[PDB]
Amino acid sequence: RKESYSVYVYKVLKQVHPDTGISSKAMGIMNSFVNDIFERIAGEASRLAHYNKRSTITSREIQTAVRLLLPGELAKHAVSEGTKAVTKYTSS
Amino acid sequence: RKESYSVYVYKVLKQVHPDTGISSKAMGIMNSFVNDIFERIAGEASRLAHYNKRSTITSREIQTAVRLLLPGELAKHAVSEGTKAVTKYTSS
Amino acid sequence: QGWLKEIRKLQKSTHLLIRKLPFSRLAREICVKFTRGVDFNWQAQALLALQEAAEAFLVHLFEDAYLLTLHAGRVTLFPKDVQLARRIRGL
Amino acid sequence: GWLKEIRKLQKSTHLLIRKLPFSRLAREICVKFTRGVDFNWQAQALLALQEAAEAFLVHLFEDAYLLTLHAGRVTLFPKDVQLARRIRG
Amino acid sequence: DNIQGITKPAIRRLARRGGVKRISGLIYEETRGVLKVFLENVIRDAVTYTEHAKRKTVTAMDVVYALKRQGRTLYGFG
Amino acid sequence: RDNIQGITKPAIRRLARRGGVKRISGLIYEETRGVLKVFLENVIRDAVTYTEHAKRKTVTAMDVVYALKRQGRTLYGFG
Amino acid sequence: MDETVAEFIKRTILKIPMNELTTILKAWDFLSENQLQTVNFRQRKESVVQHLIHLCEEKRASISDAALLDIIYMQFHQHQKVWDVFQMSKGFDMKQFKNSFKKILQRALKNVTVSFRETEENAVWIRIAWGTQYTKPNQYKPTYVVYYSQTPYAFTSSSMLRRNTPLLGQALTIASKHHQIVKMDLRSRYLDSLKAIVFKQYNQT
Amino acid sequence: KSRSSRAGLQFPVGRVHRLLRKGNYAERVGAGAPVYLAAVLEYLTAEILELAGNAARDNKKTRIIPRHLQLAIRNDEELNKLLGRVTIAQGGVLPNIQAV
Amino acid sequence: AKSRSSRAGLQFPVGRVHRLLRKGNYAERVGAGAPVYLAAVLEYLTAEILELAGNAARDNKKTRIIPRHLQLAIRNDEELNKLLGRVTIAQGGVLPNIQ
DNA sequence: GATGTATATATCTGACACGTGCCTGGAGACTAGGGAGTAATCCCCTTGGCGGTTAAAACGCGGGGGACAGCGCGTACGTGCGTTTAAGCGGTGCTAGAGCTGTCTACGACCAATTGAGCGGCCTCGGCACCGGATTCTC
DNA sequence: GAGAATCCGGTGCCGAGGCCGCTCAATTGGTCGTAGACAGCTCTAGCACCGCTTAAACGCACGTACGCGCTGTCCCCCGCGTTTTAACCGCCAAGGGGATTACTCCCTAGTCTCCAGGCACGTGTCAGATATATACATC
């Protein structure tokens, strides 16, 4: 009844690694990681819905929030991967 | 068409001081002061509408936000003055 | 020597360098002085959380304040070093 | 000697870095982070850049000089400035 | 007492983790002092949340939120 | 052609006198010209983004105020 | 390729309205029509140009092709700018003229950018991007010259960047087979009025 | 009959309530909150301007300039911790001199 | 009858992020394409930090991730140290740093 | 004792406190429906205590290691002063660019049925933590 | 040139991952109001430049005030061995209150309607700025 993000982190770990197990405590760290970055970006992009006097959150505002909240090379890889996800989402 | 807080700061200054003038630049500082504290308190109390799984902002949440966002004696004077304003607001 | 082994040992393991019950009694003593009369229940995980934060803060403070003793040519810390290290940040 | 110079400069409030070299420096650095596109700074925003830069440098040299009196120096070496940034983070 | 539980070898191990080679003697007071002036600013910033949701129990999320507002974000214990 | 030497040899001296330093050393003149430059990048790259988002070729004062607020060094006096 | 011309092509196509963007891209003659068929022309403009750049990421790009796109963009927005009228005197293939003008201008300053385009009534549209001997040429503030082989007249676009006006005038006078250049009062917005006020006098001298 | 004068305040109440509706802070906004908020803002504004006016008076000038707010903030202890990460335009610094 | 992450080609969920981004009161209107992009960004960040953690896990001849491995994989990399600066990982310890 | 160091006033200069017109956002009214405050409950998580051990802290001691104070050489820095260069005023032009006013359309809230993806409880078994053993290293 | 540091092996143990039941929240689908992309027009305020002019930087010569390495002295933390002590483990009782559900009710939100307040504009006029000139404070 109280959800978390353990199953999805476990699926990503079994994707990019064959059999590397993860303890039940360190997984908790991953929860408080990715209940945190989502608090920043999807918080901070909300601020860019207020300075430009808008009311929506489209993909462009999240793109600029990722351009702000991350250092250089990691931000470049993230913005290169996200639109790659969106383009194969559009032609469903 | 673009509002500000100059008139009210001028009224408070003429209240607590007889004839002390204020320049048109320093008044601008007061704008960016009190478009800022209102961004903190009425921002941060919104967070206390989310941790307790509520949807309202009553006087009690603003009271706790003032208890958090201010150092000791200034917070004590502010919480002593605010309820004094509210009690003479209720019996209208 | 001796210290050269202890720095290698303590930087390897990830234990708790402060004992449990004195830190818990200190936290309860501080919590009593605010909003008196009533006691305050503590969950057993919250005191561990505050202990991990306090240990990480003090280790980071000593590691940051040590760099103002190699800078003066000395080897040894002083309370001047710690007070200056807090003066630089603004805490 | 210098003591009549400090107590004159901690009294006034005007800008110290001249406006046109700082404007040329900002227009130089800005064109590298926008893929070769010019911009048009409002005449108000360059004052904001210059005030933030002056406040940051004055606070930085105050903390660096606080470091210089610790080691017996009076002179402010470049070992002092590159250490008051790693402490502050 | 209730402050002398943070003994001399405790602060000594806290320093030896930090890379400090040789330690003076007066540190063992000031560190205790700064420890107190840390924990107070975590306690009341916690307990106000405890006084808001009207319960007599400080949860771990309250301390995590007090450290969130303080500046030092803590992971794991959420 | 020098492009960073608009910061002069005594302008750094005026900033050090405002800071309260009695006697500057030598290579500080080659050090501060680094540090300032780095700081301006972490404003201007952070301030060219906001004005890129609102389809404006004009970098207003509010954009630099927002970027400085996001860095942590809040600026009041303009707007 | 470099990572500067992509922003220029993106900004130029963002300035193009959707009413004739397919006309611009068919007249520009740089991509395959199958890749025109691939691109959705029904979603919003903030991703159509992303798809078009991603087409031009792979195959070919330059600064010259982007400049020629800029020329074709400027040829359909003559209502925006304000023009100036020159004339030479004291004195023919256009290939030698192109080579002479480009070599004289590249010997005058270090960094310039010249681009030509052939148009009927023997017209040539010359885009000039000025620069210095230390900086890149500013693409975003061009200078356009409408030159005719028959008439000694030339239409001149104004710009922010002055101080290269007598340099361009003397370099174009030496680049042509002439010795004198004038500067009349004729400064207006529409090209057809200047065309009429020149050609009613020139065809009927 | 206005809500500013009904509670005996000087800062507006309708504008603060308008900025709490359109500020995306909670889905519902009570009536007892923004009067409390405007009272706290009025107290902080008076707290700054009293010290600013006294420092302007002690410099024998009948006008408030940003150097006076700089002195009043950096000489007060509470506002030193409230505004500790604040730069002020046309600011200046404190008269700081120290020897060896 | 068809999953959102399966259209997205991702692994993090999409409907849960959209539910939180409506219920969090961040804006009064949520665009449809936003949480897919946001979930892809979160997936790339978690993939990067676990990809850096597993190499240090095999470096210590282990296959079970303890928090010390996450501490080292954060602090040794430069750009993640730029990102996760003011974060104290629980049960973490410090880098081997002498003199 | 001449060089600052504070003060009288000259006037002149422009910001600013103020007065008016005026557009629109704030107040009055009232229904309505979800938010929540109060009441009860039951378990579940915390508090208190008995007891025994065993690492862990406290305390003398001496010894080298280091901090501190003086000091001489010297060199890198402040200052004085003529030049020459670049910065400011200010004035003109003058046009790209903010913005803002309509429009129409794709698009996202809003809502009824429905079902499987994910959460709670459980059960190993291999990964791992610790304990004991065999192979290197500097004083 | 041998006690100390590193790698290795064996054994208990316990949490990590697989598995099932299930339920509620995410999906699918059809409806409608509207947020915002898009175009075009209009005022404005930022950039380029130029002539002047002049205030400040630049370059240099030089005197000398600190930087730094050295060295002597004296004190003062760290390692070591012994004694003492309280932290912890595991248990056992018990009970205070945290989480859950019900139920009414009340209080804020929406829409309409009316007008008083806060903003843009314009203007005389006092506050200070800077400048010169003259009475005190001092190494």
Residue numbers in the entry:
A (entry chain D), B (entry chain H): 33 to 124
C (entry chain E): 45 to 135
D (entry chain A): 46 to 134
E (entry chain F): 24 to 101
F (entry chain B): 23 to 101
G (entry chain K): 1 to 91, 99 to 212
H (entry chain G): 15 to 114
I (entry chain C): 14 to 112
Paper text:
A crucial role in this process is played by centromeres, specialized chromatin domains whose defining mark in almost all known eukaryotes is the enrichment of centromeric protein A (CENP-A, also known as CenH3), which replaces histone H3 in nucleosomes. The primary function of centromeres is to provide a platform for the assembly of macromolecular complexes known as kinetochores, whose task in turn is the physical capture of microtubules of the mitotic spindle. In vitro, these interact specifically and selectively with two CCAN components, CENP-C and CENP-N. Binding of these proteins to CENP-A nucleosomes has been shown to require two regions where the CENP-A sequence diverges significantly from that of histone H3, the L1 loop and the C-terminal tail. In conclusion, the structure of CENP-N contains an N-terminal Pyrin domain, a central CLN-HD, and a C-terminal CENP-L dimerization domain, while CENP-L contains an N-terminal CLN-HD, interrupted immediately before the C-terminal helix by an insertion that contains a region required for CENP-N dimerization.
Using cryo electron microscopy (cryo-EM), we obtained a three-dimensional reconstruction of CENP-N1-289 bound to CENP-ANCPs at ~4.0 Å. CENP-N, whose structure changes very little upon binding to the CENP-A nucleosome, is positioned on top of the L1 loop of CENP-A (also called RG loop for the presence of a conserved arginine-glycine motif at the loop’s apex) and contacts approximately 15 base pairs of the adjacent DNA gyre. Of the ~2400 Å2 of CENP-ANCP and CENP-N surface area that become buried in the complex,~1400 Å2 are at the CENP-N:DNA interface, where both CENP-N domains form extensive interactions with DNA from bp −21 to −35 relative to the twofold axis, or superhelical location [SHL] −2 to −3. Four loops in the CLN-HD straddle the DNA double helix over ~8 bp, and the consecutive 7 bp are bound by the PYRIN domain, which is positioned to insert an arginine (R44) into the compressed minor groove in an arrangement that is reminiscent of the minor groove arginines inserted by the histones. CENP-N binds the L1 loop through a continuous interface comprising the α1 helix in CENP-NPD and the β3-β4 loop in CENP-NCLN-HD. The interaction with the CENP-A L1 loop engages a triad of residues, E3CENP-N, E7CENP-N, and R11CENP-N, whose side chains emerge from the same face of the α1 helix looking toward the L1 loop. The CENP-A residues R80CENP-A and G81CENP-A form a two-residue insertion that is the most conspicuous difference between the L1 loops in CENP-A and H3. The insertion is crucial, because it allows R80CENP-A to form hydrogen bonds with both E3CENP-N and E7CENP-N, while absence of a side chain at G81CENP-A allows the CENP-A loop to insert deeply into a cleft formed between the two CENP-N domains, where the side chain of Y147CENP-N packs tightly against V82CENP-A. In EMSAs, mutation of R80 and G81 to alanine partly ablated the preference of CENP-N for CENP-ANCPs.
